[PDB]
A paper describes a structure:
Artificially Expanded Genetic Information Systems (AEGIS) add independently replicable unnatural nucleotide pairs to the natural G:C and A:T/U pairs found in native DNA, joining the unnatural pairs through alternative modes of hydrogen bonding. Here, we investigated how two components of a synthetic AEGIS base pair: B and S, can be selectively recognized and transcribed by [name] RNAP in vitro. To further define the structural basis of base pair recognition during UBP transcription, we solved structures of three RNAP elongation complexes containing template–substrate UBPs in the active site. Strikingly, our structural studies reveal that the trigger loop can adopt a fully closed active state in all cryo-EM structures.
Author numbering:
A (entry chain J): 248 to 824, 833 to 839
B (entry chain I): 1 to 57, 67 to 102, 118 to 226, 337 to 885, 919 to 977, 1017 to 1342
C (entry chain J): 1333 to 1373
D (entry chain K): 10 to 80
E (entry chain J): 16 to 142
Write the structure that this text describes.
DNA sequence: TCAGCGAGAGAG
RNA sequence: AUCGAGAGG
DNA sequence: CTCTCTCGCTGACCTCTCGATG
């Protein structure tokens, strides 16, 4: 039965390779039997003896001495030694991994309303995944007697099973997994919320740990069965226990993109905005004034603030004063937990500032307040990013007015340096470096002019006079807040694309003097494709190196466990400064 | 310009500025032209079947011809057979005509029907035959000294390599075998040491001359010819049976026999040109002079009087198409016949024998049908939309029989080469393991008579550019100076500037007016067909352009076709050349039209003598494609209309009045909305769903076969044990479902509907052989197919019969006899039998059709590499709106634009807003019922806008009815065309916006639909073209609790088709180990898989309300123990 | 081959061996379990 | 007990023993038949056991003493 | 119920003790009638019943007969799962080497003795 | 193919 | 079941 | 004793569709 004969829809059968090698060996061995009885001359016998040892070597390990035997097709047959070794052998395909029951798979979308410990599960999947529990709860209440009545009731989809299912998932966690599992944060435990539809909803704050996106991605779901498994899921793998990385110390749940943009927009300030110069009794008055339409989010005002600080014994002591701030910061102050200073929000916030806020809260207050603080931060960021109406247009990509003069001067310089080569005055290999340096300097000049024109643009009127301030450009705000942009890519958008390289690695003499707002021509576009294809091929053809290295590293050190409490030895190493604090 | 009838109904406005001097060619020439030179008669006998017959032909061959196919394409597709023709050959020994076999035929669009399915043969790019000199750069030896080598490659035969050694010694290899000293081969050609020294020496330097031959002779352990032959024989064939006759024959047949070696005409030409000879013709076999010349050239390169070749140069690789591979396979099949003929010609007989007795047609047919159906280059054709087929038919592959391998291929062959300019697209390529190994043909590219790609250029004479066009190849163009296509010319053809940007010798620079030789023909010469459909491509990054070109081929046709407002101008060419429409063969007047048939009455000056003169077009209705999609044709002409030649009479899938149309036009705003477009999510309105703008039709097939098993015979009947009477309601008296029945999951069709799948029955087919017995429904339906098919043919012939009868009655017996003969022939063709498989009596096939609507979890994309998944369907009173109360359709996140530098998607959004703005102004004028003069004035002002464009439309020559019809067709927006590298500027877009009474920034004020408050900044709103890709969440959701298991390893099966489970691999086990969850790991390893008793105990315990497990031992460990014991090794468990 | 020649024994003291056989790994919530076995040997 | 289990970890001592103690306590209520020491509040046995551990009414020594008393 | 795994070379007596049946010369399943050949690769006597608690001939079809071999067939009545367990053996008519112990980088069957791999391989292949 | 390593003959 | 071809993350 | 030089031998995540052959 370990080498069975499988019937087909037609009369014919499908057989294994082993049954052929056995028959070959049997036939040849029986052929040797007749020769001994007939007393054939040893010349004929010696040929047959060489034959049998050729057959056996095929059955044990085919191809050690090249004589590979094939079948109906021109493909080598598989020996016994081929079924226990390799990537498709018993060890690596059936014993270190396998397929399981109570599992499912689907596409993932976003749910912006969930709490950190929740997930959204379709009820069509949930009904199938939890069938025995429903059968048991049906038999318990007497609604069915046999084991087929419950099956019929579930198949007919009556109106009473939709409450049993709600009762049997109330506090039962599930496991979610994404296919490339690079570290242990690739499997996590959540609590299901029954939804309509066919897609799974995932919390926005857990994407970075999964390396997940909403472009077509998929995910798998598993169900724990025993009490010990449920308690292990709740106490070890639940997403509210995994907030710091195990490879370093920094947190892993961090806001990004829309949340960063929203908080950054609230916490900025302007000059001569509506309602500037008021004195307020607290944050609630600021919220009233903003909602009524009587003040701007960016107005500079005075507000009375109360804060708390911890003493030596661990108790909280209050302190009240008046502070210079803005309406948006006073509004944001209402979600900060007690025990933190007011200076932590009296500035414009970016990615680093928000991450530092979360880390400080965890350091001072503990674990439970941090989850609430993170969820409130996400809600407020989503709420206030939409109210701003931030967009993108073609007029936001501003090109400096001095680009033409710089480019013309560089061209004149490189044209003049050819006169030193027409009449011998420089090495034939020396003009190359001079031209490269000239073009690099011109590129730097153009980039600096563009960035100086973009970052600061106010020309604003303050009570009569003219003043300058940080700009409110959409692209500049996106780059400065740390949401998506980089200063290098704004160069390609509105400066110069720069110098390209040949496929071998040399530098092309003349650069690309066009950005993406004003298009490229055929030659520049043709030149730009070498690097694109090279990068794509590099990405595609060297994931296997990393996979192989990781597998070897896991196999070498897989059996090292902490098995003792104190060794007692006095040895050590001496650490020197990278700061010293980060190293000890 | 004079406009065609199809194009005068809706004229696209063009923004291009450079005049066109050459037309886009027919896009399917590479297949039809190749297959033509395989079956057409060639008196010079050098291309196809004639060459193969003359290359092997005692028996005398006279001629050949091809017969008439038994069935046509449609009947072959319906029945499930191959569309082929018989091959007849005339031989003399007496004169007789014999039968050789069946040759598959190519259809009108460049495909093959093999077993009822359409297939495509992909062209191959491979190394050319000849001689090549190469050298490894380094790392062969630690000394860091380069080594030079030379190789000879024929079309057929064995290889030959010469190479050097770290000690400067010559060595030779045959068929990649072990090395031998070189001079041995010289000794095998009747040369003594004196003659060798005379050949290679005249004196021995140390920098420009070398003693390499003398030292090699020193190391050579041979001094006689026979010693050389025996050494070669021992090296080639171990075993050493040295005989004088054996040694001579091997060397004679190795390189000097016409039946074992062939250096083709192209190989001869390249070989001669590499050695700087004069003639380009010769023989297919080698000679001593050739080998000596190769040795001298290699030695000279070693000395320093030459250079090595580039292996990736596109002048060294050539193209092989289907008409060549078919000939190769036919010759392979033919050489097996002659052995049998020679064997049967030695038995001894006369008089009674005939040529047919010595010919067996099995091997030839076997080889041909193996190639057409089992080759790696014969592929299941891609049929998602019209663009997919065009892209598939124009593909080039570096893999195949004489090709490369995915894993062994390095990095240099996958790169873009400077010689690809104008021949291979540098953008469109797969993104997986096949990157760089699959390519697409450029728009104007061709091949010459040897098989090398070439591209066209304009001749320049005395400083003026003319209209004379020459096709140049990679070798030729390196000796010239070629100017770009965007150079400025005056009315006399002179260059305006004194310095021109030009290409020469693989570099680019500036040249004078009088140093230029040629010029480009177009600005879209370097891209492929798919990449030329992306507007504003020059504002996009190359990675995103690749993504968009690839994703444009996955779109699904919708219920209604909708043209793009912003296009490039290549839609008509693709739509017409694809072959999915109906095109008029001759001009005339429409006589009859309904939903499934068109009749044309031909003009007087296009009729042959003695002809009735009507054309009949039948249309395809609700047929499934290879991807389970829908194919449907719809007429687009009215009764009594005049038609010219080449006009579109009906539309195919994804076509709108003769233009390609893959998606829908949507109103979009760029802004964030409450986290519902967080990463790449898309928020959609409910009005989109209510209007069915992304609803698709899918068709599925199911089969039922009753076996002829001897144990129990089975037949189709209504009676079924243990079923209700309601179950048989949809079944007829014969047990087959009615047409028009609405079924759902778990219903009997022929007794069967797969779980979760619904639909409607639209087609039932019955297949029977020449056997016995028949059913009532088959008598009612299978006979109904034949009677209906006869009725359609009778109706078609009736029109011609009536016309001829009316003409005559104004020799009827001859006409009546002819028409009766035609009817009898049609009936006989329709009444033939079917050849089934043994053990099968009859087959029943059922077709189902279902409709699919969008829902959260479906994938959408544009043309610029932007893709996403739908997250929410929003009520209409929640969407943002404007000052007139108009809401938007789609909301997209701006944060996805600045990181991926695809700026073009913004520019399109600005232009589409302008286009719609024109249509609105027309729409109002049609509601108020104004006079034709005002419409004329406004439309003329609209068509004249631009900065020195080349279109020049004039409406003063239009009739009033024509103007009204154009205005009616223009009332939903004015279409606009912008070529890939010669398009519209920002200033022109702003002028169009101003003409439409819209802001020139492209941004307006919006209000919140839930509170009525105004957003704080202006937002970008416009129109953009969206696509629906074939990744539907209905096909991806799956779940399981318990089911079926495998046989050897008692583990769950895999795959949604067979209700399988998910795989828990090694990396997941590592993750669970790193968590510390031992009980979860043990539960997954045993009781959910491989534990036969534990699984049952766990199930019973769960049903009883007790959550506890009793693990045991997995079965795979027992299997492994038995398997290891079968190798003769004792392995066991130590209980004590 | 080397193991069959030498005649070796395996005590199943690592993670992979217990995974292959199908027992509790000697780490985490299973660690204490293995501590009992040594106490009974 | 809900959302976060950090309270019981500081009382038992480590995460790997809390799972075993909670499972031993919960199996008594689910199958053996026993009454909770806290209001049920419509909870599963695992959550009730975690709540009892958090309050301070359950640990290994108490269960051992009760088992000795029963026999 | 176990605590270690042992591995070692086998001997003819051990292999004979594993087997439930003698050598098997016939080939296959008799494609015409699916019942297996006697004394073959698929054989009911050597390896076990084809169906649960049923004889090949069919004389005994009850649990009361459990543990009884058939006089006319020689087939025991037992659960069919034993077909996954029982093994067999073949009697070679001449000694044959083991490819694993001959071909390797540190060859074993040729390291106990002095001679290298080339000449010993020549001897084994009758040359 | 390409990179890496050990077993085996050489010429001093 | 194996082989070949293609697609998605 | 001890560098050169041939010459083999072993290695390079998850999911879906089609057809031809057993
Ligand atoms: N061959 C491969 N092997 C592998 O082991 N993992 C692969 C993979 N190919 C894709 N992935 C996964 O897919 C993610 C990026 O692919 P993608 O969804 O498009 O997002 P991307 O970041 O590129 O941004 P976008 O294209 O939307 O602009 C990538 O990390 C990875 O997990
Ligand atoms: Mg993704
Ligand atoms: Zn019996």
């Amino acid at each position: 039965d370990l080498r069975p004969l499988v019937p087909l829809d037609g009369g014919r059968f499908a057989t294994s390779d082993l049954n052929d090698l056995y028959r070959r060996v049997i036939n040849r061995n029986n052929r040797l039997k007749r020769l001994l009885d007939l007393a054939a001359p040893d010349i004929i016998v010696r040929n047959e003896k060489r034959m049998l040892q050729e057959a056996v070597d095929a059955l044990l390990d085919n191809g050690r001495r090249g004589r590979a035997i094939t079948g109906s097709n021109k493909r080598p047959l598989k020996s016994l030694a081929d079924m226990i070794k390799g990537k498709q052998g018993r060890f690596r395909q059936n014993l270190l991994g396998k397929r399981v029951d109570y599992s499912g798979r689907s596409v993932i979308t976003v749910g912006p309303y969930l709490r950190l410990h929740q997930c959204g599960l379709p009820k069509k999947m949930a009904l199938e995944l939890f069938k025995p529990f429903i059968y048991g709860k049906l038999e318990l209440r007497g609604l069915a007697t046999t084991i087929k009545a419950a099956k019929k009731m579930v198949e007919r989809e009556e109106a009473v099973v939709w409450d049993i299912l709600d009762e049997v998932i109330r506090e039962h966690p599930v496991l979610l997994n994404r296919a490339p599992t690079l570290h242990r944060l690739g499997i996590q435990a959540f609590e299901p919320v029954l939804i309509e539809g066919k897609a799974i909803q995932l919390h926005p704050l857990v994407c970075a740990a999964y390396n997940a996106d909403f472009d077509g991605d998929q995910m798998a779901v598993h169900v724990p069965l025993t009490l010990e498994a449920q308690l292990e899921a709740r106490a070890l793998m639940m997403s509210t226990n995994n907030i710091l990385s195990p490879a370093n110390g920094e947190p892993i749940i961090v806001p990004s993109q829309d949340v960063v943009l929203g908080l950054y927009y609230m916490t900025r300030d302007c000059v001569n905005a509506k309602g500037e110069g008021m004195v307020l009794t607290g944050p609630k008055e600021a919220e009233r004034l903003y909602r009524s339409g009587l003040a701007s989010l960016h107005a500079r005002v005075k507000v009375r603030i109360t804060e708390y600080e911890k003493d030596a014994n661990g108790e909280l002591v209050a302190k009240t004063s008046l502070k210079d701030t803005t309406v948006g910061r006073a509004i944001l102050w209402m979600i900060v937990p007690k025990g933190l200073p007011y200076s932590i929000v009296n500035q414009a916030l970016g990615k680093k500032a928000i991450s530092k806020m979360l880390n400080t809260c965890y350091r001072i207050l503990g674990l439970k307040p941090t989850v609430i603080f993170a969820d409130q931060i996400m809600y407020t960021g989503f709420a206030y990013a939409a109210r701003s109406g931030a967009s993108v247009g073609i007029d936001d990509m501003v090109i400096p007015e001095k680009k033409h003069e710089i480019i013309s001067e560089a061209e004149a310089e490189v044209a003049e340096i050819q006169e030193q080569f027409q009449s011998g005055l420089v090495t034939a290999g020396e003009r190359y470096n001079k031209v490269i340096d000239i073009w690099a300097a011109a590129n730097d000049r153009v980039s600096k002019a563009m960035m100086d024109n973009l970052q600061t643009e106010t020309v604003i009127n303050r009570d009569g006079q003219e003043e300058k301030q940080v700009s409110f450009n959409s692209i500049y705000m996106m780059a400065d807040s740390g949401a998506r942009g980089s200063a290098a890519q704004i160069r390609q958008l509105a400066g110069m694309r720069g110098l390209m390289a040949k496929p071998d690695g040399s530098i092309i003499e003349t650069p690309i003097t066009a950005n993406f707002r004003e298009g490229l021509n055929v030659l520049q576009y043709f030149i730009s494709t070498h690097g694109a294809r090279k990068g794509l091929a590099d990405t595609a053809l060297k994931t296997a190196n990393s996979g192989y290295l990781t597998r070897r590293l896991v196999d070498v050190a897989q059996d090292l466990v902490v098995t003792e409490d104190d060794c007692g030895t006095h040895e050590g190493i001496m650490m020197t400064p990278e700061p010293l604090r980060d190293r000890v | 310009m004079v406009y065609s009838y199809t194009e005068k109904k809706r004229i696209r406005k063009d923004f291009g500025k450079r005049p066109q001097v050459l037309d886009v060619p027919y896009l399917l020439s590479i297949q039809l032209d190749s297959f033509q030179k395989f079956i057409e008669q060639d008196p010079e006998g050098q291309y196809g079947l004639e060459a193969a017959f003359r290359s092997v032909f005692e028996l005398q061959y006279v001629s050949y011809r091809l017969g008439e196919p038994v069935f046509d394409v449609q009947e072959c597709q319906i029945r499930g057979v191959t569309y082929s023709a018989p091959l007849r050959v005339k031989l003399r020994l007496k004169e007789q005509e014999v039968y050789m076999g069946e040759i598959p035929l190519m259809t009108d669009n460049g495909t093959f029907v093999i077993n009822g399915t359409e297939r495509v043969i992909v062209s191959q790019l491979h190394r050319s035959p000849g001689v090549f000199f190469d050298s490894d750069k380094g790392k062969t030896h630690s000394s860091g000294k380069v080594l030079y080598n030379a190789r000879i490659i024929p079309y057929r035969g064995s290889w030959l390599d010469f190479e050097f050694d770290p000690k400067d010694n010559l060595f030779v290899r045959i068929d990649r075998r072990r090395k031998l000293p070189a001079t041995i081969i010289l000794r095998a050609l009747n040369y003594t040491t004196e003659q060798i020294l005379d050949l290679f020496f005249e004196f021995t330097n140390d920098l420009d001359h070398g003693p390499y031959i003398s030292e090699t002779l020193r190391v050579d352990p041979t001094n006689d010819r026979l010693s050389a032959l025996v050494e070669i024989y021992r090296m080639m064939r171990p075993g050493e049976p040295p005989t004088r006759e054996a040694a001579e024959s091997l060397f004679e047949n190795l390189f000097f026999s016409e039946d074992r070696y062939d250096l083709s005409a192209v190989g001869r030409m390249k070989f001669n040109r590499s050695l700087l000879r004069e003639e380009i013709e010769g023989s297919g076999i080698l000679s001593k002079d050739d080998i000596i010349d190769v040795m001298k050239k290699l030695i000279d390169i070693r000395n320093g009087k030459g250079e090595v070749d580039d292996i990736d140069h596109l002048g060294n690789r050539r193209i092989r198409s289907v008409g060549e591979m078919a000939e190769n396979q036919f010759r392979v099949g033919l050489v097996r016949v002659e052995r049998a003929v020679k064997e049967r010609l030695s038995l001894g007989d006369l008089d009674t024998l005939m040529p047919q007795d010595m010919i067996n047609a099995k091997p030839i047919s076997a080889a041909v049908k193996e190639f057409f159906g089992s080759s790696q280059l014969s592929q299941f054709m891609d049929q998602n939309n019209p663009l997919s087929e065009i892209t598939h038919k124009r593909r080039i592959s570096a893999l195949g029989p004489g090709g490369l391998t995915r894993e062994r291929a390095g990095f240099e062959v996958r790169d873009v080469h400077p010689t690809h300019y104008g021949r291979v697209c540098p953008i469109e390529t797969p993104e997986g393991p096949n990157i760089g190994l699959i390519n697409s043909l450029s728009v104007y590219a061709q091949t010459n008579e040897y098989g090398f790609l070439e591209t066209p250029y304009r001749k320049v004479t005395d400083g003026v550019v003319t209209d004379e066009i020459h096709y140049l190849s990679a070798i030729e163009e390196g000796n010239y100076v070629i100017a770009q296509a965007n150079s400025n010319l005056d009315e006399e053809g002179h260059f305006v500037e004194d310095l021109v940007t030009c290409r020469s010798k693989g570099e680019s620079s500036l040249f004078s007016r009088d140093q230029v030789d040629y010029m480009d023909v177009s600005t879209q010469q370097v891209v492929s067909v798919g990449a030329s459909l992306i507007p504003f491509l020059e504002h996009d990054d190359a990675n995103r352009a690749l993504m968009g070109a690839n994703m444009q081929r996955q779109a699904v046709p919708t219920l209604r076709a909708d043209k793009p407002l912003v296009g490039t101008g290549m839609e008509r060419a693709v739509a017409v050349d694809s072959g999915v429409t109906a095109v008029a063969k001759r001009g005339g007047v429409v006589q009859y039209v309904d939903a499934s048939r068109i009749v044309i009455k031909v003009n007087e000056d296009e009729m042959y003598p003695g002809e009735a003169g009507i054309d009949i077009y039948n249309l395809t209705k609700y047929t499934r494609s290879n991807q389970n999609t829908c194919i449907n044709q719809m007429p687009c002409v009215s009764l009594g209309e005049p038609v010219e030649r080449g006009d579109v009479l009906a539309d195919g899938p994804s076509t709108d009045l003769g233009e390609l149309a893959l998606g829908q036009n949507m109103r979009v705003a760029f802004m964030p909305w409450n986290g519902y477009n967080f990463e790449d999510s898309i928020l959609v309105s409910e009005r989109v769903v209510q209007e069915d703008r992304f609803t698709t039709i899918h068709i599925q097939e199911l089969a039922c076969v009753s076996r002829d098993t001897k144990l129990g015979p089975e037949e189709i009947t209504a009676d079924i044990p243990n079923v209700g009477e309601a179950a048989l309601s949809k079944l007829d008296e014969s047990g087959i479902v009615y047409i028009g029945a609405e079924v759902t999951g778990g219903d009997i069709l022929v007794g069967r509907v797969p779980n979760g799948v619904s639909g409607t029955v639209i087609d039932v087919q019955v297949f029977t052989r020449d056997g016995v017995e028949k059913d009532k429904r088959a008598l009612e339906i299978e006979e109904m197919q034949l009677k209906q098919a006869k009725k359609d043919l009778s109706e078609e012939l009736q029109i011609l019969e009536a016309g001829l009868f009316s003409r005559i009655r104004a020799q009827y017996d001859e006409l009546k006899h002819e028409f009766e003969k035609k009817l009898e022939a049609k009936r006989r063709k329709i009444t033939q039998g079917d050849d089934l498989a043994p053990g099968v009596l009859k087959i029943v096939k059922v077709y189902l059709a279902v409709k699919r609507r969008i829902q959260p979890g479906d994938k959408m994309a544009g043309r610029h590499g932007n893709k996403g998944v739908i997250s929410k369907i929003n009520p209409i009173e929640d969407m943002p709106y404007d000052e007139n109360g108009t809401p938007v359709d789609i909301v997209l996140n701006p944060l996805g634009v600045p990181s991926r530098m695809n700026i073009g998607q913004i520019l399109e959004t600005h232009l589409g807003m302008a286009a719609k703005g024109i249509g609105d102004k027309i729409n109002a004028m049609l509601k108020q019922q104004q006079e034709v003069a005002k419409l004329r004035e406004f439309i003329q002002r609209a068509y004249d806008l631009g900065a020195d464009v080349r279109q020049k439309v004039d409406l003063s020559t239009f009739s009033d009815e024509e103007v009204m019809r154009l205005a009616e067709n223009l009332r939903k927006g004015m279409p606009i065309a912008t070529p890939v590298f010669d398009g519209a500027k920002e200033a022109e877009i702003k002028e169009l916006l101003k003409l439409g009474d819209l802001p020139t920034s492209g941004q307006i004020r919006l209000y919140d639909g839930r509170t009525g408050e105004q957003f704080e900044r202006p937002v970008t709103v416009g129109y953009m073209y969206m696509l629906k890709l074939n990744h539907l969440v209905d096909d991806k959701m799956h779940a399981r609790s318990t089911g079926s298991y495998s046989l050897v390893t008692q583990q769950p099966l895999g795959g949604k088709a067979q209700f399988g489970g998910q795989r828990f691999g090694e990396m997941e086990v590592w993750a669970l180990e790193a968590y510390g969850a031992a009980y979860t790991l043990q539960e997954m390893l045993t009781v959910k898989s491989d534990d036969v008793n534990g699984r049952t105990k766990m199930y019973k315990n769960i049903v009883d309300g007790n959550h506890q497990m009793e693990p045991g031992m997995p079965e795979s460990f027992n299997v492994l123990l038995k398997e290891i014991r079968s190798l003769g090794i004792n392995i066991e468990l130590e209980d004590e | 081959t080397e193991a069959a020649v030498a005649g070796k024994r395996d005590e199943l003291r690592g993670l992979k061996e217990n995974v292959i056989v199908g027992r509790l790994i000697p780490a985490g919530t299973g660690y204490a379990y293995h501590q009992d076995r040594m106490r009974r040997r | 007990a809900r959302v976060t289990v950090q309270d019981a970890v500081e009382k038992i001592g480590n995460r790997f023993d809390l799972v075993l103690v909670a499972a031993r306590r919960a199996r008594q209520m689910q199958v053996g038949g026993k009454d909770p020491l806290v209001p049920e509040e419509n909870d599963k046995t695992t959550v009730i056991a975690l709540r009892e551990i958090e309050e301070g009414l359950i640990n290994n020594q108490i269960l051992d003493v009760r088992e000795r008393q029963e026999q | 119920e176990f605590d270690a795994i042992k591995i070692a070379l086998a001997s003819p007596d051990m292999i004979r003790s594993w087997s439930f049946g003698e050598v098997k010369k016939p080939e296959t399943i008799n494609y015409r009638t699916f019942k297996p050949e006697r004394d073959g690769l698929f054989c009911a006597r050597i390896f076990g019943p084809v169906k649960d608690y049923e004889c090949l001939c069919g004389k005994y079809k009850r649990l009361k007969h459990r543990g009884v071999i058939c006089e006319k067939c020689g087939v025991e009545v037992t659960q069919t799962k034993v077909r996954r367990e029982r093994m067999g053996h073949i009697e070679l008519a001449s000694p044959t080497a083991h490819i694993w112990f001959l071909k390797s980088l540190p060859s074993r069957i040729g390291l106990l003795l002095d001679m290298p791999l080339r000449d010993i391989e020549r001897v084994l292949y009758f040359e």
